[PDB]
Design a protein around this ligand. Sequence first.
Ligand code: ATP
Ligand code: MG
Lengths: 831, 395
Amino acid sequence: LSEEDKQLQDELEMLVERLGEKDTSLYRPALEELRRQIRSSTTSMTSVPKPLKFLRPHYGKLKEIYENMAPGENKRFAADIISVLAMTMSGERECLKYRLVGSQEELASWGHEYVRHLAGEVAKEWQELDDAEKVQREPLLTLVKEIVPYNMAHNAEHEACDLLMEIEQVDMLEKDIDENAYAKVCLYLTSCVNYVPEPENSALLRCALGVFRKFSRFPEALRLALMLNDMELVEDIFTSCKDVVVQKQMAFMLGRHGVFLELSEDVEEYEDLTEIMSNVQLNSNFLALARELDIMEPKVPDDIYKTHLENSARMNLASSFVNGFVNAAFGQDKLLTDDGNKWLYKNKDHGMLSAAASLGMILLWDVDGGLTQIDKYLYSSEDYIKSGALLACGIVNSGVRNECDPALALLSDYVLHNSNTMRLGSIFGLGLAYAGSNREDVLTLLLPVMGDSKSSMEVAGVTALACGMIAVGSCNGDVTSTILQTIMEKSETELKDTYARWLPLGLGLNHLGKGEAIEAILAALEVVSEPFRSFANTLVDVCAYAGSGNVLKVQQLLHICSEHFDADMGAHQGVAVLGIALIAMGEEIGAEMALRTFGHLLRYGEPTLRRAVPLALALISVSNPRLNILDTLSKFSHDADPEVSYNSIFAMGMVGSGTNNARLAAMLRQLAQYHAKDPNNLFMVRLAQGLTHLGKGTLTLCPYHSDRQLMSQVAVAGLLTVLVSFLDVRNIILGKSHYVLYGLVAAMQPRMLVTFDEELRPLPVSVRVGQAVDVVGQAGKPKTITGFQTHTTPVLLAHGERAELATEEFLPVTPILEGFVILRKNPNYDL
Amino acid sequence: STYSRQIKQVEDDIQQLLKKINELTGIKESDTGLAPPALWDLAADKQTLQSEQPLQVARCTKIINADSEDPKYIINVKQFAKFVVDLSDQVAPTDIEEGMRVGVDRNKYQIHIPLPPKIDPTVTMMQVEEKPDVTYSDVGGCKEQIEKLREVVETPLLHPERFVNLGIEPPKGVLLFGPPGTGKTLCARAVANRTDACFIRVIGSELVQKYVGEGARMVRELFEMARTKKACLIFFDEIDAIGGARFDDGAGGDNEVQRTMLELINQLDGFDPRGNIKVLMATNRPDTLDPALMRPGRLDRKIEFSLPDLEGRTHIFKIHARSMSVERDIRFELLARLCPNSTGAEIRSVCTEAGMFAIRARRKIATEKDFLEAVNKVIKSYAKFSATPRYMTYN
Ligand SMILES: Nc1ncnc2c1ncn2[C@@H]1O[C@H](COP(=O)(O)OP(=O)(O)OP(=O)(O)O)[C@@H](O)[C@H]1O
Ligand SMILES: [Mg+2]
């Protein structure tokens, strides 16, 4: 027993004896010393007064002092000692009570560990407090107005955000945000929006948006608005900025997302602002890198096949896709940009449909020069070439918005042509040209096609895919009304056709990512008969929660996956597997849980259940060639079930789409030898090689940009269109409708990091490119890149790598160094 | 800390869940080489264990009465026995040739499947399966050397059409020689990264073996396995281990190793055509190589990796100081001038040591003084151990 410890053990009696005297003259010196006695051990975080822990039973003698008379100074310091003692035990409605009723001085005077205990109990009783207890939160709000400043003072800021989150009072955080800590709060809160459910999704997003707006950080404020899909806020965010240089860089992010904004002529620099967001200069900027990265030379499919190292209509059609995929958005090719009539007519039947359409994929984003080359094939007498070119119209404007549209002129008068093929190149092309536009003129021109009597199920589904792509994520009731109207008018027998599966997809795309906006639509779908109703409601429900991560929604999908049918009844089972990928794709943590579940579905699932797992792998990790998935897809490449075999090979190329993976290309080359005697399997093999070398390693199909936090509705629409169509790879892809692979054009974007000057000319500078590192939590300055290398700016960033400027000579407008970025010269540099 | 209690509750529930998940899922253990249960096709394995019968590996020796309709095959079943058997009904008579390995049954020993020729597992591992992380952009000061190396070992495989049309037979061998650290293996590593044909890496010390005739045997199986591919590359790093010139010192001095070189010489240019193999030899002692090995038809191109010049040394400095957090005004041209005859390896160490002086000083950016101190420490202080002065005489 230490004498100093015994000295405090004495105060359990003599100091209480001083507080046991009737006169108040001895009360204050004992209590004031007792109040300071706690602070004596509070100066050390680990040291606590153990004799004080023996004073807990002594509160009975002190019960009357802090309760039974005036609260001036007798109860003031008497209760606070109990509050510190209330820190040790459970402290249910005690630790807060003595602090609330006792001394109301500065909160940090009793210790950081005490308030941390106190702050936690503040949220605990807040949930307990009901509506009638609003007259109990008056001192509760006072503490949080002082707890929050204390937490940010000692860099314990992530604890502060936690206090307001539990009590649902994150509104008052912004008033106390300072210049030195704005970046930490928003980065912390934004990381939380992917796991908190509704309605706190928007609330945390708006509150994080408020901090950015107050601190004049517009470019990152616009990112939060886009994540919120608040078109009015996007208007308000854009026009509030008076720095046109920031506005020019902002227009790039809108163009990258595909969100168009109709500015007023009164806004300064109106011309260049519309050009930047319309991506009209994307073709020239993309060609500028190609000259800089000395990869402009065309690549024949033979250079991709590499058959000289290896120890038909389908073959010719396969190489048409490989030629288009490899030379996509380049404008030059040794096989079709030359005299391609020998090659174009080498294909047969619908092989010429995709071959003619593949010509526009080399000319992707080149609306002016691309339309200059298609015109030769537009007057072809053979029906496939013209409509294949008609679809090649939609590809050439895909991803670009023209002030007056060329594509509609070339495609308006062929949506109601008597020949079904000519329409087939019209609506599908028209969809790709204006995917993510919600424009009424095209939709009104495209709408009556679906209800046309001569419109076959093939074009009717194509119409649903197109109008769903134009109005993706818009909840346009006009497109919604007809999609239901066509669906229940159709007879039960023709609903067996797999081209009717595209109708719910068009409905689902129209409500892509909206969430709770489908119950009215789901109400209409009960009337539709089974098993299509099982298919239809699953497709739209999945599309409603796309990129949301809702664990509740994926709970029901596996419940569909739990009951296995001994095909016709289990048609909807494939979308359920595809559903897990579409919802969990939003953030990394949700996504790689899905791979573990995807393993069991490939193991315990039925053939139809396991025929969709590879597509889910492709959706969950498109253009992200991780080894775990690629090894997973490799094992089922040579599957006994033919559909799983084709689907896995396509997913392997889809997973490494545009990554130019040397290891993955070797597997496909080995797969080409193994599947050389299988025409069906070998067609997927060639397809994957083209996708692997998509755009010669300069194009991505990933729907997520802005550091994988902002989701592109257009890209998923093309992603969903191909992958849902791959549920019937035998009849759609391997059949006569392989043109649906051109839906991937809507998702084709460059993996770009181009630094432009304030006048928008190219500005090459040294940059560091490396794997992204999560920097939530740890204070100070943590590195956001690991295993990085230094390159000039015109470099391609594959999935998961960030970019930081190596030097400080230039100040980027956006913290996200992706896409087109404007650099401003640093005044501090060269001081 | 207010969530410390709630963290451990969900962490323990999670850890209990994986342990619970692994109970039903399985995959526990692996010491007997068991694959995860998701890959268990036990229905097919039971059929495989019955429908597919095991086959003993045997070598065909002589075909008796091949012309007639009753061709008898004499087989050598390794260490078991020798049998005169006939072909199975599911294999063509023309698919089995004398001297080739076959698969035979355990009942009547009839040949059931032709088999690949036996190849030493050590030789099989000598082929490169993961390409190195070195590109030609990582080699500085070797411009002319690199074009000569590519146009023999890379261009003919990539674009063979430009050689057959003009009746051109491209050289099938390159010797890279130079002092240590000049970039001989670095350029070879760049070749393997870019090449799409099969790349085999051979180290001369790997061809030295305990018993008599092994090194020649391994060379024979090396080229035998290389010939089973349309295009192949064999890299012989440190060929001087076995490529030394033949001599007679009374006793059997290096007689066994010379036979290994003679076999390698025979495969490169002998009675039989080599094939589509393009060999690549690297050595720092080319003066010791045998004259017959240093002859065109075996080593057609002699690319010399001399010490880089001022322009080359500046290029190497930029390559290695690309990712450094250097200052703005680092005079790399001055640094190249401070090390007149220095290998590229020394320049890399200068770059590494330059950042080491700054890391020692707790500085995040390396100044020009650090590079100046690095040159003194590497080029000057470590000049006692420099291999350049002795090895320029050998090259
Ligand atoms: N020309 C060069 N450009 C860039 N780095 C070089 C160059 N030459 C050498 N280096 C560097 O020096 C290192 C020396 O290893 P390297 O394999 O090139 O040596 P080498 O010439 O094969 O030597 P040795 O004769 O000892 O086998 C390389 O790993 C590389 O990092
Ligand atoms: Mg070497």
